[PDB]
A paper describes a structure:
Next, we aimed to structurally investigate the complex between CtRea1-[name] and its two ligands, the ubiquitin-like domains ([name]) of CtRsa4 and CtYtm1. However, purification and crystallization proved to be challenging and might have been impeded by the conserved but flexible [name] loop (element II). Since this loop (deletion of amino acids 4734–4773 in CtRea1, or 4657–4696 in ScRea1) is dispensable for [name]–Rsa4 interaction, we replaced it with a short Gly-Ser-Gly linker. Using these trimmed constructs, we were able to reconstitute the complexes CtRea1-[name]∆loop–CtRsa4-[name] and CtRea1-[name]∆loop–CtYtm1-[name], which readily crystallized, allowing us to solve their crystal structures at 1.89 and 1.84 Å, respectively. Although the overall structures of the [name]-[name] ∆loop domain in complex with either Rsa4-[name] or [name]-[name] are highly similar to the [name] apo structure, the terminal helices α1 and α9 were slightly tilted (as observed upon binding of integrins to its ligands for the C-terminal helix). The Mg2+-binding site in this case is fully ordered and the metal ion is coordinated cooperatively by the [name] and [name] domains. However, one unforeseen major structural re-arrangement concerns the [name]-specific element III, which in the apo structure forms a loop that crawls along helices α1 and α9 and was not fully resolved, but in the ligand-bound form becomes re-arranged, the short helix α8 partially unfolds and forms a β-hairpin that provides an additional binding site for the [name] domains of Rsa4 and [name]. To assess the functional relevance of the [name]-[name] β-hairpin–[name] interactions, we performed genetic interaction studies with Rsa4 and [name]. The combination of the [name] Y4859 > A/R I4871 > A/R constructs with mutant alleles of either Rsa4 (rsa4-1) or [name] ([name] S78L)25,38 yielded cells, which were no longer viable.
One of these energy-consuming enzymes is the conserved huge AAA+-type ATPase [name] (also known as Mdn1), which is composed of a hexameric AAA+-ATPase domain, followed by a long tail consisting of an α-helical linker region, a flexible aspartate/glutamate (D/E)-rich domain and a C-terminal metal-ion-dependent adhesion site ([name]) homologous to the inserted (I) domain within the α-subunits (αI) of integrins that mediate ligand recognition. The conserved interaction between the C-terminal [name]-[name] and the Rsa4-[name] (ubiquitin-like domain) or [name]-[name] is essential for assembly of the 60S pre-ribosome in a reaction mediated by the [name] ATPase upon ATP hydrolysis that leads to the removal of [name] and Rsa4 from distinct pre-60S intermediates. In this study, we report crystal structures of the [name] (Ct) [name]-[name], both alone and in complex with its pre-ribosomal substrates, the CtYtm1- or CtRsa4-[name] domains. Besides displaying the typical [name] fold known for integrins, the CtRea1-[name] crystal structures reveal evolutionary conserved [name] specific structural elements.
Numbering used by the authors:
A (entry chain A): 4698 to 4735, 4776 to 4886, 4890 to 4994
B (entry chain B): 12 to 98
Write the structure that this text describes.
Amino acid sequence: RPLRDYGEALEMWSTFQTKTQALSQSLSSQLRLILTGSSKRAYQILLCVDDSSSMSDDNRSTAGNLALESLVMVARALTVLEAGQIGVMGFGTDVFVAHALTDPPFTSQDAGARVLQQFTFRQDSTDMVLLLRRTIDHFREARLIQASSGEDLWQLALILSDGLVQSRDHARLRPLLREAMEQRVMVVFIVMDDARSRKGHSVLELKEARFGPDGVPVIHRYLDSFPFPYYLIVHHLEDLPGALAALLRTWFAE
Amino acid sequence: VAQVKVIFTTTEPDLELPESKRQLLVPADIRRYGLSRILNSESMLDTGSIPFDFLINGSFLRSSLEDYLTSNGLSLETTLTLQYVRS
Ligand SMILES: [Mg+2]
C-alpha cells in the first residue's frame, strides 16, 4: 500500500512524541533565544525527508525510523515559533509536498500522523539534485507570496536522510547549493547514522573504490566529497537538539 | 559510473578486514574478478593476488552486481552483503 495504515501512523506519532518530548523541549528552549525576543521576523522551515528504499528496514537500515523520530522531535520543537510556518517534503525518485507551509500546524496528532502516513521508504532512487531544485523553487514562490501586506522572512531547509547519493551527484549539487546561499536559503543536512544499527557500520567509515587509468583500485572516504556546507551526524536522537541549535545559533543568525 | 553499496564479510580466520574497511561503494558493473582485485589491494587485505569468490545470501555471484540486482528485482538503493571465500 502506498500509505501506511493510518492507525499505525497514529501509534508512531504518539510513541515518537513521548520518546522525544524532553529532547524537543531542549531544542525549543534554545530556538527561543536564537529566533525570538530580543525584530518582527517570519520563519519558513521545510523538513525534507528521504523516502528512498536505502532508508528502509527491508534494506536492514534503521535510517527511516530515525528520520521519522527526528521529524516528530523537530516539528514539535518548532511549533513554539509564533511567526513560523512548517512544511514537509518527501523525496526519492520524485519530490512530494507532504504538508504545505500554509497547512494546519503540528499541534494535532492527526496532522502529524497524516504526514507519517506518506513515508514508506520504497522509492528506487535518491535524486538529491531534484530535491534541491524543488526546494529552491518552493521557497522562491513563497518569497513572492510574502510580498502581500512587510516581512523579514528567513527560510530554512532541513534534510533528513542517510546521506547516500551517487558520488557523481556530489559535484552536480554544488551549483544548486550556491544558488540556495545566494537566495539566502540556509540548507542543513541531518545525516541519519543510527549507532545501534550494527557494530561497525557508520557512514563515517564508508569508503568508495575507483579504478585508476592504470587499473589499480584507489579507495577514498565517501564523505570527503560530500558537498553540503552545514551538516550534522545523528548517532542517537540525543545528538540532535544541541547540534542543530549550535549550527543555527552560529550561522542562521550571524 | 553508477555505484552499488557493498559490505564485505568472511568466515575464514586469517582474512578479516578491519571494521573500518568493510563497507564500500563500488562501480555497479563490477564482477567477481574486479571485486577480488579490490580485496587484494594495498588499502584492503594487501594479499596481492588470491582469487576470491563471493556469496550473496548463500549463493555464488556469477554476474555483475547490477545484473544481480536486476535479476532479483532490486534497485541501486540496496546494500549487498558479499561474503568472500578463497577460490
Ligand atoms: Mg537512498
